[PDB]
Amino acid sequence: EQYYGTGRRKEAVARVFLRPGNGKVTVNGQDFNEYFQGLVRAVAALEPLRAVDALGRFDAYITVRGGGKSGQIDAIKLGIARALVQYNPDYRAKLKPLGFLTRDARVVERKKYGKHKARRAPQYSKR
Amino acid sequence: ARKALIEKAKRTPKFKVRAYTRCVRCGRARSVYRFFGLCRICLRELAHKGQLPGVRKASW
Amino acid sequence: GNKIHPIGFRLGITRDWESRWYAGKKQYRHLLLEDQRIRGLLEKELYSAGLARVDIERAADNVAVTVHVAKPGVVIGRGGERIRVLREELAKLTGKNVALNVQEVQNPNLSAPLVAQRVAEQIERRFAVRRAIKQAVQRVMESGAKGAKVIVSGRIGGAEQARTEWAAQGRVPLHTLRANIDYGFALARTTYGVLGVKAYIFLGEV
Amino acid sequence: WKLEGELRAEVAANIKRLMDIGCYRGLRHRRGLPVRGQRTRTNARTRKGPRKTVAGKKKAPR
Amino acid sequence: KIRIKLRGFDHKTLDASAQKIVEAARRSGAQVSGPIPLPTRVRRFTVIRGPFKHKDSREHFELRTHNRLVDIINPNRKTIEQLMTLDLPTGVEIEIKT
Amino acid sequence: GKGDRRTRRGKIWRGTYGKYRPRK
Amino acid sequence: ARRRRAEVRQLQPDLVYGDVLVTAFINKIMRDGKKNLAARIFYDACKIIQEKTGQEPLKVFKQAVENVKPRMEVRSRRVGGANYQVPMEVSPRRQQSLALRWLVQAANQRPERRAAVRIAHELMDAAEGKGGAVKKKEDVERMAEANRAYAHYRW
Amino acid sequence: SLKKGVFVDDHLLEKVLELNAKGEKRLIKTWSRRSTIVPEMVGHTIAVYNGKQHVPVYITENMVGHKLGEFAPTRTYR
RNA sequence: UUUAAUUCGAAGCAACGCGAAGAACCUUACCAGGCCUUGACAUGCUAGGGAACCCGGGUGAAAGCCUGGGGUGCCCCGCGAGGGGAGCCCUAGCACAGGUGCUGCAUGGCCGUCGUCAGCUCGUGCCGUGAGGUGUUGGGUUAAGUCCCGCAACGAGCGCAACCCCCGCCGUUAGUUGCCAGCGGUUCGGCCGGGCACUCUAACGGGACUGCCCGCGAAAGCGGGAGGAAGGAGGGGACGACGUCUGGUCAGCAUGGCCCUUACGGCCUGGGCGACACACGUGCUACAAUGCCCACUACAAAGCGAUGCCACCCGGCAACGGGGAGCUAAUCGCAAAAAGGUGGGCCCAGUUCGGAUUGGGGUCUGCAACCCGACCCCUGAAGCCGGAAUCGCUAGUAAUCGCGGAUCAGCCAUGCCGCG
Ligand SMILES: [Mg+2]
Ligand SMILES: [Mg+2]
Ligand SMILES: [Mg+2]
Ligand SMILES: [Mg+2]
Ligand SMILES: [Mg+2]
Ligand SMILES: [Mg+2]
Ligand SMILES: [Mg+2]
Ligand SMILES: [Mg+2]
Ligand SMILES: [Mg+2]
Ligand SMILES: [Mg+2]
Ligand SMILES: [Mg+2]
Ligand SMILES: [Mg+2]
């Protein structure tokens, strides 16, 4: 019935549940394109469904928390791949050639004293 | 003006405003953290000895 | 300007607090202040006793002070009259009731604070520094240290030009965080001002 | 409400009125500088024109 | 039904108390909601290393107040008996609600 | 912009509320 | 830098046409990480290529890029007193990068007021062998050649 | 600007107001720059300290909302 | 430069949003003026009084000077007269205190800096009359004196790295204040039953090692590949060798020496550190259409708070004010995140760009906002992208967008340290 992947990216966490069906997709109880409305990049979320043909063959109940939409989009891209590799282990030999099962460790780097913001150094003068 | 200024800081006077933080070992009047009652020098000096309970070099 | 406090650098790991109580924002201020008037008083009165630490625990708002001395004889008294007044002194200056326990520092030659104090005391009494230093380090190592360092600051022998005579034996891996390097620091007050003394004793790993 | 000219009028009057027995604020206006407590050591270029570069200074020779 | 809240700076000796105040409470025959780790509040102190002049270079300290929650969900007199008498606190603060 | 108090952004910026950034 | 050749960043393909070359260009349109605006600007602009021709924007896009790539550039090299602008080849990679940047840089010199129109027309003009991007590129081969005399320092 | 009270100091207010039990001289040294000028105190020459000296300010109805300091520059030539 | 004073220090990098993580009074070290002297503070000795404490009266700007009252618990001779008495407090005398007065080449401590650069040494041997050399010159390799090979050296130490924290994958423990997948119910917001699965929280663990495969190489290593959340130091911290700089700090503290003693000490009121013809550093806001305004609608993290965060009403255009829950806070609050998205307005204009300056009328803190506070509400400067020059950054970096904190009554924070 219900397949699961946890998706995380950059302080975003995506609880992702996959069922079979017509093709519908909900994020925090909203339609996917109402939630991610106007964000050119949103579609990237489902890119792991297209990688196994199986787009419309699934319905997905997604909850998402923390971060911003684009992290959430990425987190969802990971949940969705984790979820479906869950219910068919072979969806992995063709899903790992793309990055879909990687987490993406890239995170805001820490502000450091003496710098203005991690690397950006104060302007230096001499004269 | 120092010994008598660490003293006049303890007496509490006309107008509540005139009172000020003032470090508890150093008489220092600047950079005293109200949690510890200590100057930022004082706090470092003690912190390193393990005499501020709980207090540790932070790193993240 | 460098080398951080080998104690401060350890704390969670390898080496423990000298005061372990809890207090919230409203309280810490006042208990810390006490701690300090406590340590301060014991720091001068128990000089002759060679005190290394003054650990301070605190529970049901009641205060136990362990004084880790080399010479409990001196803190105690004949049949304990001195420690009497000491328990009463603390009580005078704290509005409270304070346990004051002694604890013999088993080997004083592995107590960095003491080694340091001893060299400082030696200097205060016009002893040759280089030799005093070198000997302190022999004592430490003889007492089974894996390594030891001692450093006298400047105005050695009374000079105009301040200096810094160091001297060391064994390992003193200051960057190594599992090490357990006791560290200690006493003054020499002299006719010619202050010299500071640092001792590092390295005792073992893990 | 009033309003162009019969407003200009009012403003000037206020300021000239501020010369009175001469408040600090009333100097300042006379003097060209800013009124409202501002730093004159570095800015105030709105209340003075652009920069009158009356200069001359370096260090000690021998 | 009894909430006992444990604060501490040392997380090793907080946990050691939580476990103790549970070990003994189950031994009074009370059911206990295992010691729950509540989030840590952290207090940074960021301080100039030098006494005088050196506004860049500086050292971060933190004072991590740990928190543990413990519910004993149906409590005996025998249960109140062990707690309001049989103690082990050094640098830990417990406080009791209902 | 951020220097105009009499707007949304110059209010946010200054850290305040009024006729041009009402408290919710 | 000094140790090694440095890895060239593989851009993620485009979400519409699936072209890595489109996200490059988008990344040049992008200002202050406002990538939505950027891609939103590039796609409007692709629709302007519809309204003003029954051609696919991708085809015409790819054609502008091909006409703004330079063949050779003067690259500054130093003798030790006076300096010579020396002519030499352009890398494949550098070409692409130059092409897209000029395109954008050129597009924003333009006098129309919306960006999407600016980018569309400048794309149209460049695929028709003559925008302001193409002058830049021309200027650059007319800077080589104007200096073909010094092509014997080819570094 | 205050708005409950007019924050004038009483040592000033009294030396002033007893003085209008039939009007007298004006050797009225004060230090309270702080103090607002009050209605009808027009006529009193007040000697307001400016850090150095007391500078006699002749008072008048056009200047009531103003503190006394306002008419005694603390700093000399600009 | 000026001033009565504009206290003091920092001076290429490594002084100049630096000490200062909060200058109206306080701070405060300076100026003026008014006041105090065994002193605001300490240790102790002599003495008549007083001996705790607490209240008003004059004179003052306040300090202060002068004043007049309420009124002795305590050790103890005692059943009391009366009388010893120790704390404690004022008067005078004696020792002494006080000094942010000088010296950072008299110092300690701490810091900067070369530089996280890859170095700096030692023990014994051997070479050299010797200073010294070898080791640590060479070849390869590495982020690295990292490793390999070689070699009159064989080892070792301080450094590198590792051991420590954060971030990334997973597991075990735990299930409230946190979560809500499947139920059941429902005043919709997990609100109630249930449940801890997932998310979290936070404590302990696992996991990466060039381990495996291919190629090159004598080796160390390198190129590539596979698996894996993650490789080739996974990304960030903490961490700074022997030493350098007669570096910085006597104004945090300590300290030798020098100096002040009805004053160079101490208290106050006011002024000043905020001055402005200039010059420089670091920043902020901009010059706009990839923009600006207004409405509506989202998606964070890390912090902070019970004389404090303040929900929610109401009044007020509004700052704020009246009410007034909740919250010892994974509970309640600060909290709106902004940029984004959706509507609409602007139409290239010194403008619906930009918000300086100035006038008024308000609010709040505080004894008090004149010098000198912030905030709210009704003039609209320069500026059309900046000369010579010059800075930052190699990836979740720069760029841009907001959020929080320390100090703090308030705030001149556009700074700082953090968070996304
Ligand atoms: Mg950022
Ligand atoms: Mg600098
Ligand atoms: Mg204050
Ligand atoms: Mg700075
Ligand atoms: Mg505007
Ligand atoms: Mg000085
Ligand atoms: Mg020096
Ligand atoms: Mg100097
Ligand atoms: Mg010097
Ligand atoms: Mg200043
Ligand atoms: Mg103009
Ligand atoms: Mg224009």
Q: Report the number of distinct structural domains present in chain C.
A: 2
Q: Which of C106, C127, C145 is the last residue of a domain?
A: C106
The Cα–Cα gap between G108 and G105 comes to: 5
Nearest to C199 by CA among C182, C176, C180: C182
Q: Looking at residue C166, which CATH number applies to its domain? A: 3.30.1140.32
C133 plus C92 within the same structural domain: no
Interface-testing mutation among B26, B38, B41, B59, with chain E (most E C-beta atoms within 10 A): B41
- Running DSSP on this structure, what letter comes out for residue G9? P
Of the CA atoms within 13 Å of residue E4, those in its CB half-sphere come to 23
**In this complex, which chains have at least 3 CB pairs below 8 Å with chain H?**
D
The separation between the first and the last C-alpha atoms of chain H, rounded to the nearest angstrom, is 27
In degrees, to the nearest 5, what angle opens at C-alpha A66 toward C-alphas A63 and A69? 75
Q: What is the dihedral of CA B19, B22, B27, B32, to 10 degrees?
A: -160
The Cα–Cα gap between G37 and C71 comes to: 77
CB distance from E89 to chain B under 8 Å? no
Nearest to C60 by CA among C97, C95, C86: C97
What token pair was written down for C156? 């050695």
CB atoms within 10 A of CB C42: 21
SS3 sequence of chain A: CCEEEEEEECCEEEEEEEEECCCCEEECCEEHHHHCCCCCCHHHHHHHHHCCCCCCCEEEEEEEECCCHHHHHHHHHHHHHHHHHHCCCCCCCCCCCCCCCCCCCCCCCCCCCCCCCCCCCCCCCCC
Q: What is the DSSP string of H41-71?
A: -TT-EEEEE-SSSEEEEE--GGGSSSBSGGG
Backbone angles phi, psi at C49, to 5 degrees: -75, -10
* Residue A77: domain span: 1-127
The Cα–Cα gap between A5 and H67 comes to: 72
* Residue C195: domain span: 107-206
Contacts of B50 (CB under 8 A, 6+ apart): C7, C8, C11, C15, C16, C17, C18, C19
Q: Residue C64: what residue type?
A: A
Q: Looking at residue C81, which CATH number applies to its domain? A: 3.30.300.20
| Strand partners of residue E97 | E3
CA of A117 to the centre of ligand 1 (A): 7
In degrees, to the nearest 5, what angle opens at C-alpha B21 toward C-alphas B17 and B25? 155
Q: Looking at residue A49, which CATH number applies to its domain? A: 3.30.230.10
Helices (H), G20-128: 20-29, 35-51, 57-68, 92-107, 115-127
Element (H, E) at C4: none
Nearest to E42 by CA among E69, E9, E74, E73: E9
The Cα–Cα gap between C84 and E98 comes to: 44
Element (H, E) at D9: helix D8-17
Nearest to C111 by CA among C123, C122, C103, C100: C103
Contacts of G58 (CB under 8 A, 6+ apart): G17, G19, G22, G46
The Cα–Cα gap between A9 and A7 comes to: 7
C143 plus C157 within the same structural domain: yes
Interatomic CA–C1' length for residue F20 and nucleotide I111, angstroms:
48
Q: Residue E10: what residue type?
A: D
Q: Do C22 and E9 touch (CB under 8 A)?
A: yes
- Running DSSP on this structure, what letter comes out for residue F18? B
Element (H, E) at C199: strand C193-202
CB atoms within 10 A of CB E80: 15
Name the pairing type of β-strands H45-49 and H29-30: parallel
Residues 44-63 of H with CB under 7 A from strand I: 49-53
Nucleic strand I within 7 A of Cβ A30:
no
SS3 sequence of C22-60: CCCHHHHHHHHHHHHHHHHHHHHHCCCCCEEEEEEEECC
Q: Report the number of distinct structural domains present in chain A.
A: 1
Quick one: C21 exposed, middle or buried, by C-beta within 10 A (0-12, 13-18, 19+)? buried
Domains of chain B: 1-60 (4.10.830.10)
Domains of chain G: 1-155 (1.10.455.10)
What token pair was written down for G38? 């950027």
With H, G, I as helix, E, B as strand and everything else as coil, classify residue B20: coil
Domains of chain H: 1-78 (3.30.860.10)
**Ion ligand 5 neighbours, Cβ < 5 Å:** F 4
What token pair was written down for C126? 């016009």
The Cα–Cα gap between A78 and D10 comes to: 69
What token pair was written down for G63? 């054609």
Which residue in this structure is represented by tokens 């890029």? G65
Q: In angstroms, what is the C-alpha Rg of chain G?
A: 17
Task: Determine the residue of chain A that is closest to G23 in CA distance.
Answer: A41
Q: What is the DSSP string of C85-128?
A: HHHHHHHHHSSS-EEEEEEE-S-GGG-HHHHHHHHHHHHHTT--
The Cα–Cα gap between C175 and C202 comes to: 12
Within the 3-32 window of chain D, which residues sit less than 8 Å (CB to CB) from chain H?
17, 20-25, 27, 31
Task: Determine the residue of chain A that is closest to E55 in CA distance.
Answer: A114
The separation between the first and the last C-alpha atoms of chain A, rounded to the nearest angstrom, is 71
Quick one: E52 exposed, middle or buried, by C-beta within 10 A (0-12, 13-18, 19+)? exposed
C132 plus C87 within the same structural domain: no
Are residues G8 and G92 in contact, defined by beta-carbon separation less than 8 angstroms? Answer: no
The Cα–Cα gap between G74 and G112 comes to: 32
The Cα–Cα gap between H65 and H36 comes to: 6
CB atoms within 10 A of CB C174: 16
What token pair was written down for H76? 């000399």
What token pair was written down for G37? 């605006």
Q: After which residues is chain C broken (C to N over 2.5 A)?
A: none
C113 plus C70 within the same structural domain: no
Domains of chain E: 1-98 (3.30.70.600)
How far off is chain E from C11, nearest CA to CA, in Å?
11
C124 plus C202 within the same structural domain: yes
The Cα–Cα gap between B11 and B16 comes to: 11
Does residue C8 sit within a domain? Answer: no
Q: Do E63 and B54 touch (CB under 8 A)?
A: yes
Q: Residue G4: what residue type?
A: R
The Cα–Cα gap between C87 and C67 comes to: 12
Task: Determine the residue of chain A that is closest to G41 in CA distance.
Answer: A40
Quick one: E96 exposed, middle or buried, by C-beta within 10 A (0-12, 13-18, 19+)? exposed
Interface-testing mutation among D21, D25, D39, D47, with chain H (most H C-beta atoms within 10 A): D21
In degrees, to the nearest 5, what angle opens at C-alpha C36 toward C-alphas E87 and C183? 95
Of the CA atoms within 13 Å of residue B34, those in its CB half-sphere come to 4
The Cα–Cα gap between A38 and C190 comes to: 78
